[PDB]
Point group: D2
Chain length 268, copies 4
């Protein structure tokens, strides 16, 4: 068996072994999937990381902001998996926001050029990935994106939060197009995970106050979550992502699935 | 393997072979679960129905409004699966609303004695079942209830919609308690299903106007659903319930999963 | 002038001079309305209290759970305001929940008889009041109920939280009926107010610990609220209720207006 | 008295006498406000229109995408109202989206430069206007933006819908900053209004299919609205906007008020 047995799935956004995408790709492999990986800048460095995965997988360059990479991508992808074969799953684990639009810089001081870049990479990218890949997706297929609940404003995240609100709106439209191909589109809203950017600020990068704000945020999460929340374990969210890649949520699309320990359902 | 291989799961609310509980129980067994069933009032009939299931399973009587059935329940359940064994999953598929509070009788004309019965059975029962069964559930366990999205008012459902609002709220509180035992609690919001009662009313059992109302509702669902909606196929919801009973949504609780074809995400 | 100049408005749920309803009635009178008050059980005491209001007003008995009181109510109101006169506004500020379903008693230990009583008074009452009063309301009118945001579970409120979810759902159905008369129906979701029950529990009543859970809830409100929150000042909510009774939210119905200082929009 | 008596309020986004901003400004003046208007391109043309307003009001140029205009804005505003005077209200009624991101062009075919332009004007501008204006606003003041409900995907609106999700997110962050000055920030989510562009598309300017999409949308709104919805009457949304500019929603911020006839609360 295996939840994802003989499914060909693309996974983007692995940069380190702490990346959420990394564990997705691992659990997918643990579970009988056959992957195709995308990388962004330091591929040789990335390639170095993905070797640590339980199975080998093709690594492709994908700068989401490059139109040519996008146009060429399905071709480049089909070559890697064999003609007369298509993808069954796609995972979008891509995000970025300049420190001017996130962290300690005041909310009003973020220049739209920085914000437009963050939105380009964090929201629009979900459609442009979906536009590129849907022609080579099999009916019954699934696209999963990574969300962080933006329904209420929170202190540090600022413009990333605004970007996530847009991504949520975008997923809904993508589900409309994806429907034509019999493909589902959903976001997983994860609670906070100790990935390097998160790890950097809890470590004290950018000051002690910002790290205590974040720890206050992390503390509140595990508190509110009736089954707790472990910033250090990215596996429960990866299992959730795989569930949406599987055939076990066949009637769910344009939706958001909350992998946060139930934090978002409790006030305190 | 089976998604629920060697999982011990209780399933309530089977009254006919069209009942959602029936397809839940069926898909569960297909996927390696070992079930215990509860039924209300017409036991002889229910047992007769459960024989059509892929495996034999114990049938226990449970009128949720009967306190004795509730107190005895954990005892009676343990007897059925062997001492030193506990439940891994529990499914609440129970709903009821008097015609005075649902269908064609005007909203203002439902007597609270009737409404109180509908809420007792459709919302409160969810807590009283979890109170009875949590002491005999294993950590890692899951409780799933059945929801019908009450976030907006709809024409016929009336007080059942109100009952569902209450159930959603109850699910959130149950999750707090279930968390102590390492148990998740969630609802599946299904789109409309052609169960006997639905087939009855679309057929004209409640008048010409009410049967046209349902078809109008169903057509709209399937239109809005980017992946369509088939009132006659209860399987995608039973798979969804099974996904939550599995170990693949480990970080989700107090929450609602929409198995509605994505209807709720589209305006039109 | 006056925002509510020469509008005839009924106001319920006055029991002390700390009652939100009391400030509603006060600000209403300040704003040129002519009121009719309903009171429950301690009529003589209420009358003693309503004398402290800036204007005289008829006081009518209304135990929402008494069918006789409801049927007689429309008659009794017109009698009090003169035949050929109709109500322009109605205010529902009524709630009740037994301590078995609220406070320190565990969630699972509330007997449905107690919960059913709480729902009867806090949710259903909203409907049975609209049913009584709509026939004698003028087009352009407003029915306002009092809400406490139940979208997430919180520690002490328990079954009152569940009751508020139900009331919300009820408001949506009531708007459908009220629409036929050209009448709006809405809830104000207020933040916590140091009303007598709140005053009792912050006082070491029910333990130091339950009061500390509550103070954490109260503190957090003022923290999260971008304009802060003053538990001792009920005036901002009475103003909000008056805004909905006015002709200045004419296209808003079946909705919830949050007078919480914006707390519900911020995570922390 | 007038709801907005002797309040100094800035109003942007007037381009025609059908513009929502126009009725806002009209009802604001009717209600005792002293306005300051902003215009964007066709200033000479706008002045001709604003002459049709019940009172004269200074017209200032403001291209939201021009930083210089933003920086100069507070100065230019203070000149118009007298030094030592500040604003009590600000209205953001600004939106724009290229036909590539809205209407008949497929969702996947919108170029990010066009999308980025739309979000710039429709979402970011709400922040950049507030940054410019908060220093010269009196405590107790109010900022209102115009929303169109993006919580569910709809056929034509596409990237404008995405922009509004972002704008909602932004409103929440702006209220945190606005709070320091004792100022509220809120959006009014309006149902569809027959402004020239809407009338245009209904006429067939974007094809037969798109004009039928809109009427189908408008028809559904008035059905669902328990109090109906008149696409041709913008006064109820302008009345709503004025209510938020008043001192009658003092405990509401970072929030959204729905002036939609209650459509969003009904399923059908
Ligand atoms: N980190 C968290 O606490 C957490 C929580 C909620 C949601 N998320 C979301 O999950 C995703 C992954 O999170 P993470 O913490 O693992 O982040 P990460 O830092 O590990 O990965 C972010 C990824 O974005 C990719 N990326 C940036 N620009 C790109 C571009 N131009 N083209 C292609 N790829 C590009 C990088 O390759 C990187 O792998 C993000 O989108 C994030 O918004 C993360
Ligand atoms: N079909 C739909 O449109 C739909 C959609 C969403 C959710 N649901 C929900 O699914 C669940 C079952 O729906 P269904 O379509 O299978 O209906 P069904 O009639 O087949 O099952 C309803 C069950 O409730 C049980 N019940 C009634 N009173 C009881 C009592 N006092 N004690 C124990 N059980 C009692 C009945 O025995 C019956 O098995 C309900 O919770 C319903 O609210 C149905
Ligand atoms: N006080 C708060 O912190 C708060 C916050 C949010 C919402 N609310 C809601 O506002 C309303 C009033 O709040 P409050 O704090 O002023 O409470 P309160 O105790 O001062 O008033 C509640 C009222 O309900 C009335 N009541 C109880 N049972 C009744 C029945 N059988 N028939 C008629 N009236 C009955 C009482 O006479 C009393 O006037 C309640 O519905 C409550 O749920 C209160
Ligand atoms: N009309 C509707 O059906 C509808 C519904 C809900 C909300 N809204 C919102 O109401 C607001 C105005 O709507 P409308 O229907 O009056 O539109 P409109 O075309 O009449 O006004 C839009 C205004 O935005 C201004 N504008 C555009 N780009 C600008 C820029 N770069 N800098 C400065 N100003 C700029 C224009 O000058 C124009 O006056 C928009 O924000 C829209 O999102 C419209
Ligand atoms: C949400 C979500 C959670 C983690 N991420 C990844 C994919 C990112 N994308 N852009 C990023 N840039 C920035 C800018 C500033 N910081 C560090 C930072 C912060 F200031 C505030 C909160 C959290 C974090 Cl970590 N990071 S970090 N995204
Ligand atoms: C939700 C959900 C959807 C179907 N159900 C099952 C469990 C029910 N339980 N009580 C019910 N009472 C009533 C009262 C009247 N009717 C028939 C009826 C109706 F008038 C309107 C819509 C559907 C149905 Cl069938 N049914 S229907 N629950
Ligand atoms: C919401 C809302 C906010 C205040 N109320 C009024 C109308 C009420 N009606 N019945 C009530 N019962 C009970 C039962 C126990 N307590 C006191 C109590 C508590 F233990 C925990 C939290 C708050 C409060 Cl006060 N109160 S409190 N309702
Ligand atoms: C929401 C909301 C409602 C009307 N608007 C104004 C302020 C706008 N700003 N940019 C706009 N671009 C576009 C792009 C295409 N169309 C015409 C058009 C359409 F294809 C679909 C629906 C309505 C309209 Cl009119 N208009 S329309 N915004």
């Amino acid at each position: 068996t295996g939840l994802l047995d003989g499914k060909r799935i693309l996974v983007s956004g692995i940069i380190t072994d702490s990346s959420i995408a990394f564990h997705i790709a691992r659990v997918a492999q643990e579970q009988g999937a056959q992957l195709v990986l995308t990388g962004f800048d330091r591929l040789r460095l990335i390639q170095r990381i993905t070797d640590r995965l339980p199975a080998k997988a093709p690594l492709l360059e994908l700068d989401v902001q490059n139109e040519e990479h996008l146009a060429s991508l399905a071709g480049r992808v089909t070559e890697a998996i064999g003609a007369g074969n298509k993808l069954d799953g796609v995972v979008h684990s891509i995000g970025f926001m300049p420190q001017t639009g996130m962290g300690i810089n005041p909310f009003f001081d973020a220049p739209y050029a920085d914000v437009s870049k963050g939105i380009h990479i964090s929201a629009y990218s979900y459609a442009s990935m979906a536009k590129a890949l849907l022609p080579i997706m099999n009916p019954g297929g699934s696209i999963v994106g990574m969300d962080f609940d933006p329904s209420r404003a929170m202190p540090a995240y600022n413009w990333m939060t605004v970007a996530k609100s847009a991504l949520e709106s975008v997923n809904r439209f993508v589900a409309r197009e994806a429907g034509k191909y019999g493909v589902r589109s959903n976001l997983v809203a994860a609670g906070p995970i100790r990935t390097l950017a998160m790890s950097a600020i809890v470590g004290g990068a950018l000051g002690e106050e910002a790290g205590a704000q974040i720890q206050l945020l992390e503390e509140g999460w595990d508190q509110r979550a009736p089954i707790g929340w472990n910033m250090k374990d990215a596996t429960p969210v990866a299992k959730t992502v795989c569930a949406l890649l599987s055939d076990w949520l066949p009637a769910t699309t344009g939706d958001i699935i909350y992998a946060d320990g139930g934090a978002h359902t409790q006030l305190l």
